[PDB]
Structures are given as C-alpha cells and as structure tokens.
Write an enzyme that holds these catalytic residues in place. Structure first.
Site, mmCIF file in Angstrom:
data_model
loop_
_atom_site.group_PDB
_atom_site.id
_atom_site.type_symbol
_atom_site.label_atom_id
_atom_site.label_comp_id
_atom_site.label_asym_id
_atom_site.label_seq_id
_atom_site.Cartn_x
_atom_site.Cartn_y
_atom_site.Cartn_z
ATOM 1 N N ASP A 35 0.853 -1.192 0.000
ATOM 2 C CA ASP A 35 0.000 0.000 0.000
ATOM 3 C C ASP A 35 0.884 1.235 0.000
ATOM 4 O OD1 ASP A 35 -1.908 1.878 0.308
ATOM 5 O OD2 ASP A 35 -2.424 1.355 2.376
ATOM 6 N N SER A 199 -0.821 15.686 -11.837
ATOM 7 C CA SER A 199 -1.060 15.332 -13.226
ATOM 8 C C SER A 199 -1.303 16.609 -14.043
ATOM 9 C CB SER A 199 -2.268 14.375 -13.326
ATOM 10 O OG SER A 199 -2.655 14.135 -14.625
#
Length: 330
Positions: A35, A199
C-alpha cells in the site's frame, strides 16, 4: 541488494493485489497488500481476536526465533474506506522477493474491522508511503522501504500491476524490459506523507486533452481512480445511461456499455487507461448495473490515482533525497 516479488489480484475484479512476504525465522509467509498510501506493516497474528480471523494466515511471533516484542509500542490505523486495525509491535526479519530487512517493525493486530475479517485473501498490509505516517506510538517506526533503502542498489521501488493478471514489485532496480518508451518523472510533495504529485490533465476516449493541474496521490492500496467531480462527470457523460447513484455510492453504468478509455497526463507524457480497466462489474450479483472504476473524490479531500490508473503504467517510486515519481507506458 535488490528484491523482486510477484503481486497477484485477489479476485476477478482486481480489487486488490497480494504479494508474499517472509516474516520471522523460520520464515512465515503471509500475503500482504502493498500500500503506497500508508506506512504500517501490520499482520493478522496469533494475537488477533479469534472471532475476527476468518481464513487469513497468521503471524505467530512466539514461533520466530528472531521476533522481539517492541516493549510499550502500540499502533492503530484507520483507512480512507472506513476500515481499521490496531495492536502491538514486534521487530523481526522481513524478506520481500529476496530482499531482507532485519529489525523491521511488524505490527501485530489485536483487532481488525469487519472488512479485513471478511477478506480471507489479505493477511495484512505493507505500507510504502513515507514513514512520517507510521502510526506506532510512542516511537514511530520505519517502512520496509525506508529500512531497506541504504542497502538497495538504487533507492527506488517499482509497481507493475497487472490487469486481470499478476504483476511485479521490484526493489532497488528499474527493469528496463518491463515498459515501453521512456519513463517520465514528475515532482513529489511529501508534505502529507504520500506520493503526492500533479497530473497535467486528462482526455476521455478519443477526445481532446484538457490541460489542467490535478494534485493527487499514487496509491496502490486504493482500487479505483478518484478525481474531481468535473473530470468524472465529463468521463461518464460519454457512456449512455451512466449516472451517479447515491444508493449504490457512485457512478454506475449499463453492463451492456463499451467504456471509453481515460488518459491522464504526466508532464508532457500520457498514460492511457483502456475502457475495460474502468469496469468493476455488476453492483450485486446478476445485476445489469455495473460499477464504475472512475469515481469522484468530492468529500474524500484528495484525488487518488489508485490501481485503475497505476495498472496502466510502469510506476517508479524514487526514494532519493528528493523523491520523485516516474510513469511509463507498458
């Protein structure tokens, strides 16, 4: 040193991925959910409340000649999905894919929430976010990666998740055979303890690319892609009959649909998520309403590039003094 381990979807939907991890002496192999959105290595154990264990493999520290109680240390964690676990702490030898760390904090669960009990395939979590998020008290502990780092050939690990197939976690090297083209690296903020990046925008299907900054985290422990409501609405508007269902808890679509791809920007580069990756199947067994893999991050307080996004790429988690992320197509 390096390590290399195969990671395997837990079910036909790629709801999560499990990676075998050797703990203790002799080795006890547990299948852990790696994770990158958390920083605790915790396991089902001989200490876990018996009614909360249903099929998981347990770590038994009393059977490990290298286990030592980390006296006074406790832990307690709550995840974004509402799940939780807590317990006490041992140090022990932990190996992943041939890479060994001695003295790793292995957080032994005394309690787990229902979602963990109900998932027989996940024996615990191995956190790969920054050690600043580790929950051990009163002495915070380091992740497996942070403890391995100095020994690695390069201070990196890579995630290569499969679509309905196994993939790979590598530590200490970048397998130049595992991706196409070049890796585009992008800045990381560690201020929230995550692999947080920005992004450069998105496209839906064959549509034009929208240049827009989307701050979010690279999180292998989250199944879906959670983005701003504007972006998600623009995606599902291209699917006839898709709608947001408050009863189901997100966007659903007709199982008869063919989904468009979704592209996200990494600098000037582009990662394309095929439409099929966005299908999470019937909402309930036999339903013709299917659950979407792109969902709104509204009310979660962060955008999450979870497995739907990451499995479309070869992802480099660069733990150099200034961390960075890399993405390549594959």
């Amino acid at each position: 040193s390096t390590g290399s381990a195969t990671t395997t979807p837990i079910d036909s939907l790629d709801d999560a991925y499990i990676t075998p991890v050797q703990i203790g002496t002799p080795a006890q192999t547990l299948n852990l959910d790696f994770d990158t959105g958390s920083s605790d290595l915790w396991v089902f154990s001989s200490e876990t409340t018996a009614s909360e264990v249903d099929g998981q493999t347990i770590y038994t520290p009393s059977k490990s000649t290298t286990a030592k109680l980390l006296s006074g240390a406790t832990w307690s964690i709550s995840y974004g999905d509402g799940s939780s676990s807590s317990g006490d702490v041992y140090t022990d030898t932990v190996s992943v894919g041939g890479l060994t760390v001695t003295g790793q904090a292995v957080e032994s669960a005394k309690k787990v929430s229902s979602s963990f009990t109900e998932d027989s395939t996940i024996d615990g979590l191995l956190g790969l976010a920054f050690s600043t998020l580790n929950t051990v008290s009163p002495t915070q502990q380091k992740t497996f990666f942070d403890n391995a780092k100095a020994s690695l050939d390069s201070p990196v690990f890579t995630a290569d998740l499969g679509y309905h197939a196994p993939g790979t976690y590598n530590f200490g090297f970048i397998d130049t055979t595992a991706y196409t083209g070049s890796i585009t690296y992008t800045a990381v903020s560690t201020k929230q303890g995550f692999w947080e990046w920005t992004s450069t925008g998105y496209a839906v299907g064959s549509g034009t690319f929208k240049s827009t900054s989307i701050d979010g985290i690279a999180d292998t422990g989250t199944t879906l892609l959670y983005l701003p409501a504007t972006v998600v609405s623009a995606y599902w508007a291209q699917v006839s009959g898709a709608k947001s269902s408050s009863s189901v808890g997100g966007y659903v679509f007709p199982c008869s649909a063919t989904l468009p791809s979704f592209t996200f920007g990494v600098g000037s580069a582009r990662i394309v998520i095929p439409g099929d990756y966005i299908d999470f199947g019937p909402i309930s067994t036999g339903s013709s309403s299917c659950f979407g893999g792109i969902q709104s991050s509204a009310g979660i307080g962060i955008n999450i590039f979870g497995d739907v996004a990451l499995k479309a790429a070869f992802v480099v988690f660069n733990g150099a003094t200034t961390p960075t992320l890399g993405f390549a197509s594959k």
